[PDB]
Design an enzyme around this catalytic site. Structure first.
Site, PDB file in Angstrom:
ATOM      1  N   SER A  74       0.826  -1.200   0.000  1.00  0.00           N
ATOM      2  CA  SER A  74       0.000   0.000   0.000  1.00  0.00           C
ATOM      3  C   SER A  74       0.876   1.273   0.000  1.00  0.00           C
ATOM      4  CB  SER A  74      -1.013  -0.056   1.149  1.00  0.00           C
ATOM      5  OG  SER A  74      -2.030   0.901   0.923  1.00  0.00           O
ATOM      6  N   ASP A 137     -10.517  -5.097  -3.333  1.00  0.00           N
ATOM      7  CA  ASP A 137      -9.814  -4.206  -2.420  1.00  0.00           C
ATOM      8  C   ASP A 137     -10.763  -3.066  -2.037  1.00  0.00           C
ATOM      9  OD1 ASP A 137      -8.176  -2.147  -1.325  1.00  0.00           O
ATOM     10  OD2 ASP A 137      -6.446  -3.099  -2.314  1.00  0.00           O
ATOM     11  N   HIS A 164      -7.391  -5.804   0.813  1.00  0.00           N
ATOM     12  CA  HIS A 164      -6.174  -4.971   0.843  1.00  0.00           C
ATOM     13  C   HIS A 164      -4.959  -5.755   1.362  1.00  0.00           C
ATOM     14  CE1 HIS A 164      -4.630  -0.987   0.067  1.00  0.00           C
ATOM     15  NE2 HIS A 164      -4.204  -0.804   1.304  1.00  0.00           N
TER      16      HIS A 164
HETATM   17  N1  LIG Z   1      -2.228   3.874   1.903  1.00  0.00           N
HETATM   18  C1  LIG Z   1      -3.038   3.187   2.940  1.00  0.00           C
HETATM   19  C2  LIG Z   1      -4.320   2.639   2.290  1.00  0.00           C
HETATM   20  C3  LIG Z   1      -5.114   3.688   1.583  1.00  0.00           C
HETATM   21  C4  LIG Z   1      -5.098   3.785   0.206  1.00  0.00           C
HETATM   22  C5  LIG Z   1      -5.840   4.767  -0.438  1.00  0.00           C
HETATM   23  C6  LIG Z   1      -6.590   5.657   0.301  1.00  0.00           C
HETATM   24  C7  LIG Z   1      -6.615   5.566   1.679  1.00  0.00           C
HETATM   25  C8  LIG Z   1      -5.863   4.594   2.310  1.00  0.00           C
HETATM   26  C9  LIG Z   1      -2.216   2.077   3.564  1.00  0.00           C
HETATM   27  O1  LIG Z   1      -0.978   2.152   3.470  1.00  0.00           O
HETATM   28  O2  LIG Z   1      -2.794   1.114   4.134  1.00  0.00           O
END
Ligand SMILES: N[C@@H](Cc1ccccc1)C(=O)O
Length: 192
Positions: A74, A137, A164
């Site tokens: 992510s 996701d 996710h």
């Molecule tokens: N980037 C977040 C996940 C996320 C993606 C997009 C929008 C908001 C949140 C994480 O590292 O888990």
């Protein structure tokens, strides 16, 4: 260069890296491989994951270099991709990668999304790019995962039920890493 270690760059948030999600299990499994190392550290600025904080940390504290497999989840996938714009790395394994701030203020505050992606520089700096993505996701539109796949010409492992990637174990990722440890045949990518 031949690979000497993996580095896990986690998602954003305050979860202790060693005990949250799959990071600890994966670390332990990779450390079963004779002679291999896997670094996984709690990140500075863990909540917002600012580019200006994570990328220097990856360089100096996680020692990400041309013999490193970076496994980014992510925010960590995002960081891995920006890191590869300016550093040679052995491989990147991207779990739940995307391309924009998705209108989220915390994502915007990271700084990762304030300019276009330098896809050609990434491809030039990283000969092996593997990607895991799931169509269910809850955070990411499939189109952004597909964009990464198309623009980086990744080896895409496309699932329908992993969300996710927040479960505690991840065997398919171990298999990928072990495959990269054999230094597989370079595949034809398009460089502009
Ligand atoms: N980037 C977040 C996940 C996320 C993606 C997009 C929008 C908001 C949140 C994480 O590292 O888990």
């Amino acid at each position: 260069a031949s690979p000497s270690k993996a580095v896990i760059v986690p998602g954003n948030g305050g979860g202790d890296v060693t005990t949250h999600g799959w990071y600890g299990w994966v670390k332990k499994e990779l450390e079963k491989i004779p002679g291999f190392q896997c670094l996984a550290k709690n990140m500075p600025d863990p909540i917002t994951a600012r580019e200006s904080i994570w990328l220097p940390f990856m360089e100096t504290e996680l020692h990400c270099d041309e013999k490193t497999i970076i496994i980014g989840h992510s925010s960590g996938a995002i960081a891995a991709m920006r890191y590869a714009e300016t550093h040679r790395v052995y491989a990147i394994v991207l779990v739940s990668a995307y391309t924009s701030d998705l209108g989220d203020e915390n994502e915007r505050a990271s700084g990762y999304f304030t300019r276009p992606w330098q896809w050609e520089k990434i491809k030039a700096n990283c000969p092996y790019i593997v990607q895991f993505g799931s169509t269910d996701d809850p955070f990411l539109p499939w189109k952004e995962q597909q964009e990464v796949a198309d623009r980086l010409e990744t080896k895409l492992h496309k699932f329908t039920d992993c969300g996710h990637f927040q479960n505690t174990e991840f065997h398919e990722l171990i298999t990928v890493v072990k495959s990269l440890l054999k230094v597989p045949a370079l595949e034809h990518h398009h460089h502009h």
